[PDB]
From a paper:
The large terminase protein is a key component of the DNA packaging machinery in tailed bacteriophages and evolutionarily related herpes viruses. Typically, in addition to an ATPase domain which powers DNA translocation, the large terminase contains a nuclease domain which cuts concatemeric DNA, generated by rolling circle replication. The overall structure adopts the RNase-H fold.
Subsequently a recombinant protein construct, residues 257 to 443, corresponding to the nuclease domain, crystallized in two different crystal forms, 2 and 3. Crystal forms 1 and 2 contain a single molecule, whereas crystal form 3 contains two protein molecules per asymmetric unit. The two other loops, L0 and L3, residues 295–301 and 423–427, respectively, also contribute to the active site. The β-hairpin (β9 and β10 strands on Figure 1A), a unique feature of viral large terminases not observed in other members of the RNase H-like endonucleases, is well ordered in crystal forms 2 and 3, but is invisible in the structure of the proteolytic fragment (crystal form 1). Superposition of crystal forms 1, 2 and 3 shows that four loops (L0, L1, L2, L3) surrounding the catalytic site and the β-hairpin are flexible and adopt different conformations. Importantly, all of these flexible structural segments are conserved both in phage and herpesvirus terminases. We note that D347, implicated in facilitating metal binding at site B during the catalysis (see below), is located at the N-terminus of L1. The position of this residue differs significantly between crystal forms 2 and 3, bringing the carboxyl group of D347 1.4 Å closer to the catalytic D294, which is expected to coordinate to both site A and B metals. Therefore, we suggest that D347 would coordinate metal B in a bidentate conformation, to allow formation of a similarly dehydrated and irregular coordination at metal B. Binding of metal B can be facilitated by flexibility in the position of D347, observed in the crystal structures presented here, allowing D347 to move closer to D294.
Numbering used by the authors: 256 to 349, 351 to 442
Write the structure that this text describes.
C-alpha cells in the first residue's frame, strides 16, 4: 500500500483541552525549549501551527485556521510563540511572498524552509514517519489530526515524480506543520 504513515501503530495520542483555536496538551514549562512548525495555506487550505516541546518530544499545542488574513495569521503565530517562551518558528511559505513580508514586519524569529522541491518535502515527511515508526511522535488525540495522518499517501506521476498528498481532495496542512516541527527533534 501507498500509505505514508505505516508506523501509525506507534503514534502516541495525548489528551488535550480546546481553548479557543488552540488544542492544548501542556502549558508552557519555563525549563523546557519549544519550537513551532508553521505551515501557511491559501484558499480552502488551512494554516497550522504546531508547538513541539523539544525536551519532551511531544506536541504541546496545535492551532489551526482557515481564510484569515496574513496579518491575522502572523499575529496569532506571534502570540503562540510568546506564550511558549519565544519559541523559534520553522515556516513553510512555498502562499506567495506576502506571508514572508508579514512575518518580517511583525518581527518573528523563523527559518523559512524552502519546501520548493520534491526532495526537501520527502525529507521532512520521511523524517516524521520514521520518528513515528520509532514511537517518538505524540500528538493531541484529535480526530482531525489522526485522519490527515491516516489519509496521507504516495502517488506516482507519468514522469516518475513522487507526490505526497492527502487521499482524494482532503487537506494535509497538519501533516506539514507536524513535519516542520519534528524537523527540530533530535
Amino acid at each position: 500500500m501507498n500509505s505514508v504513515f505505516s508506523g501509525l501503530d506507534m503514534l502516541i495520542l495525548l489528551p488535550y483541552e480546546r481553548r479557543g483555536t488552540r488544542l492544548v496538551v501542556e502549558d508552557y514549562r519555563p525549563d523546557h525549549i519549544y519550537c513551532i512548525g508553521a505551515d501557511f495555506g491559501k484558499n480552502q487550505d488551512y494554516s497550522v501551527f504546531s508547538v513541539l516541546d523539544l525536551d519532551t518530544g511531544a506536541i504541546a499545542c496545535l492551532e489551526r485556521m482557515n481564510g484569515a488574513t496574513w496579518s491575522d495569521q502572523v499575529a496569532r503565530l506571534k502570540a503562540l510563540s510568546e506564550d511558549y517562551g519565544h519559541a523559534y518558528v520553522v515556516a513553510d511559505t512555498w502562499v506567495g511572498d506576502a506571508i514572508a513580508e508579514e512575518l518580517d514586519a511583525q518581527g518573528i524569529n523563523y527559518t523559512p524552509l524552502p519546501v520548493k522541491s520534491s526532495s526537501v518535502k520527502e525529507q521532512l515527511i520521511s523524517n516524521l514517519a520514521l520518528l513515528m515508526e520509532k514511537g517518538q511522535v505524540a500528538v493531541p488525540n484529535d480526530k482531525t489530526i489522526l485522519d490527515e495522518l491516516r489519509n496521507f499517501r504516495y502517488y506516482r506521476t507519468a514522469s516518475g515524480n513522487q507526490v505526497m498528498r492527502a487521499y482524494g481532495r482532503g487537506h494535509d496542512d497538519i501533516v506539514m506543520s507536524l513535519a516542520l516541527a519534528y524537523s527540530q527533534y533530535e
